[PDB]
Structure formats: structure tokens, C-alpha cells
Design a protein around this ligand. Structure first.
Ligand SMILES: CC[C@@H](C)Nc1cc(C(=O)N[C@@H]2C[C@H]3CC[C@@H](C2)N3c2ccc(C(=O)C3CC3)cn2)c(C)cc1C(N)=O
Ligand SMILES: CC[C@@H](C)Nc1cc(C(=O)N[C@H]2C[C@H]3CC[C@@H](C2)N3c2ccc(C(=O)C3CC3)cn2)c(C)cc1C(N)=O
Lengths: 205, 204
């Protein structure tokens, strides 16, 4: 288990997201699904020149898995995944000028996605976020942060995932509506209706 | 014809795009198709609760029309379109904060789209851009700029388009590769392959 400091502007953005009231919190689900769709585009693109890219799983889909008992909402996709370097250095698409431009714009939250930092909208609803991921060129890894300016990365020893990413939202006690089948369906319908991959809700036992 | 000053940061971005060398200029086509797709999503959504939104045209598609004779590449869609207010005031999504700071990311051009200003990438390859558009709530208008700090807006009493937008790129003389059928196919394949509306390339 290695522990890292957030890039300064990411820490600032995270505090802003957590410590300020925003009405329109449902957009977190749109942003996560958007990222999953972009990850699916990426592996599909690679698979057109080299079909062996799909040895790790041919299916291209997004699954939403609410769990009232654990107070978790999980977004799973079979996209390209992230390597250890991605998890430690951050993605190329998250640049500090974009992070800065968004925060300036803040002072609607929904504009977050435009600037490449949509993932951090998860902290509108989640007290902790766990990201389990597997990229064809690397091993399976877990990234986790409860904000407060640090995050962790470790090799993952849980269930193998083949290829793709699970983001596990450990929800805030006042944000449990997002575990409700009805609410989830309404949000997907409003914001993610024309995404070009199946989105399937796994109804809880 | 009314002539309008560009917002100051928009003028600066435009001068920058025109007056700086960039290698990977082909991404302009990715940005335009992305906007057309976003505009298609918008009218589609509206039509779900009001079917009459499609009385101006049921088809939801994107057309690419190269014209070697006129040296123009036109990107046409049947998306939601833009009102006169949109054309004069700009879109609410193009914000000083994103414009001022995309320049900061530059100080690759390809991340322009992030910052909400993907359209202006048209000026990597075009000396003039004409935008003809029709929204359900307004008349048909033409916006046009050759840069130099201004744009014009006029009623378009030309060809009725029903609903949607045409972006006509009047290409610089050293940028004519973007009228070649095979170059356009390759750009679509690399960047826009999984857009969720038909993209039709119309032989001249
Ligand atoms: C595959 C790429 C993309 C198309 N999709 C996704 C993108 C993301 C996403 O934003 N991850 C990251 C990288 C990691 C995991 C969450 C957050 C942002 N992290 C980090 C990592 C590091 C830092 C730092 O300050 C380092 C000091 C510099 C900050 N933050 C996610 C989570 C999923 C998908 C998807 N479902 O596939
Ligand atoms: C429907 C909106 C979006 C989803 N799609 C599109 C967006 C655009 C686009 O960016 N247009 C604008 C508004 C007009 C036309 C081009 C440029 C950017 N203009 C202006 C207008 C004004 C200003 C100013 O400085 C004013 C002083 C404040 C600057 N620039 C386009 C072109 C097409 C689509 C699409 N195919 O539908």
C-alpha cells in the first residue's frame, strides 16, 4: 500500500466539491458513465487494428450495481482500463489549467465534465471512492481516496476482472437515494440515454 | 448586415489558432462532428416528450460535403440548431474561464474540445467560416467570420434547411487535402468512428 498526495489543484477542487452545497448532484452518474463510454471507445478502437486486444473480454458494456446493505453504488465497465502509471501520475487528460479553469467557472457544477475532471464529481455523493482497474498491459490495481488531500494505490487481490474498471462509491448517509432503482433509472434516462453501449442495472436481492 | 466584435478572449484564441503552427490540424473535423452529435442528442431528447419537435425533419444525421470547385468542406447536421441570440451572444457553454485557460494548456491543440471551444479549431484550416442554422423557435440565420476580431449575422433567405446547422469551411489554399475522399474517411475512422448517428460522405 503506497500513499500519495493529490496534485495541489485536485486537492483544491476536491475540497470545493465536498465543502460547498450544490443542488444538481445527480450529474455525478452522467460523468462516471461518460468516462466508462470513453474507455469503451478506446479499447474498441484498438480492437479494430488488433483483435487480440479483446482476448481479455469481447463484451463492451456498462453495469450499475446498487447495494443498500453496503451503502455502495458501483459503476463497472469493460473499457480499456488504467495502468499503474495512470493511477499514480493521473491521466494525461486531467491538466492543471483545466482544473483551474473549472474552479474559476464555479466561482453550474454540471460544467465539470467539459474540463476533463468529471470523475471528482463522485465526491458530491461519496465519502470514499475505490477504483479497481485492469488494463491489458498491466496487473489489476486498486486506487482509493476519502479526499483530505491523499490517495492510495495497491495491487488488487480480489476477483479477477478481465479488463475494464469498477468505480465503487461509498455513499454519504444523506445520499442513499442513488441506491434506488427508480432514481437511477430516471437519471440514466435524463442524462445518459443515448450512450452507445448497453447500460444495465443489476437489481438488488 | 450587422457586424459584432468577438469577446476579447475569443479574438485572442482565434489569432493564436491562425498565427501559430500546429501539426495535427485534422482534429478540427473531430470537433465539428462532436458538436453536430451533441446538437443531435439535444433535439432527440426534446422530441421524446414532444413529438412535434420533429415536424421540421425526423432524420437525425451528419453529412460531410467536399467541394473542390468552391474549395469548401461543409459539415451539415439536423441537430437542434442555434437561435439569433445564440449567434449574437454566443453559447452559454463557451465561457471566458475555459477560453482564457485553454491558451494556458497550450502554453497540444487537440485538447481544445475539453475547454468548450472546439469550434474555433475550424480556423486551423479555413480562412473563412460560414455557419447557416435553423432552430425550431427562430428563423434561418447566417453567422460568418474571416477572423480579424469581428463576425456578421444576417437572415438567410437562401435555401430553407428545415432544422439543424451547416458549417461551411472556406479552406486555406495549402489545406485542400481535407477535400479528398480518402483523407476524410481516414479522419472519420481515427476520431469519429463510434458517433451514434450516421455520417455520410457525399461524392462530388
Ligand atoms: C480510461 C481513461 C478514461 C477514459 N476513463 C476513466 C477515467 C477515470 C479517471 O479520471 N481516473 C483518475 C486517475 C486516478 C483514479 C481516479 C482519479 C482520476 N485518479 C487520480 C490519480 C492521481 C491523481 C494525482 O493528483 C497524482 C499526483 C498526480 C489524481 N487522481 C476513472 C476513475 C475511470 C475511468 C473509466 N471508467 O475507464
Ligand atoms: C447547438 C450548440 C452546440 C451543441 N453545437 C454547435 C455549436 C456551434 C458553436 O460553438 N457555435 C458558436 C456560436 C456562434 C457561431 C460559431 C461561434 C461559436 N459563434 C460565436 C458567436 C458569438 C461570439 C462572441 O464572441 C460574441 C460577443 C459574444 C463568438 N462566437 C456550432 C458553430 C455548431 C454547432 C452544431 N453543429 O450544432
Amino acid at each position: 500500500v503506497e500513499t500519495f498526495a493529490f496534485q495541489a489543484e485536485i486537492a483544491q477542487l476536491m475540497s470545493l466539491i465536498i465543502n460547498t452545497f450544490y443542488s444538481n448532484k445527480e450529474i455525478f452518474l452522467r460523468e462516471l458513465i461518460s468516462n466508462s463510454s470513453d474507455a469503451l471507445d478506446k479499447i474498441r478502437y484498438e480492437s479494430l487494428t488488433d483483435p487480440s486486444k479483446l482476448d481479455s473480454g469481447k463484451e463492451l458494456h456498462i453495469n450499475l450495481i446498487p447495494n443498500k446493505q453496503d451503502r455502495t453504488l458501483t459503476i463497472v465497465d469493460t473499457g480499456i482500463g488504467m495502468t499503474k502509471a495512470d493511477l499514480i501520475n493521473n491521466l494525461g487528460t486531467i491538466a492543471k489549467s483545466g482544473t483551474k479553469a473549472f474552479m474559476e467557472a464555479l466561482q453550474d457544477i454540471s460544467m465539470i465534465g467539459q474540463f476533463g475532471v468529471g470523475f471528482y464529481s463522485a465526491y458530491l455523493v461519496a465519502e470514499k471512492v475505490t477504483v479497481i482497474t485492469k488494463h491489458n498491459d498491466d496487473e489489476q490495481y486498486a486506487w482509493e481516496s476519502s479526499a483530505g488531500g491523499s490517495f492510495t494505490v495497491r495491487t488488487d487481490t480480489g476477483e479477477p476482472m478481465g479488463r475494464g474498471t469498477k468505480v465503487i462509491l461509498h455513499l454519504k448517509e444523506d445520499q442513499t437515494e442513488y441506491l434506488e432503482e427508480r432514481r437511477i433509472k430516471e437519471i440514466v434516462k435524463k442524462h445518459s440515454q443515448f450512450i452507445g453501449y448497453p447500460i444495465t442495472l443489476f437489481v438488488e436481492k
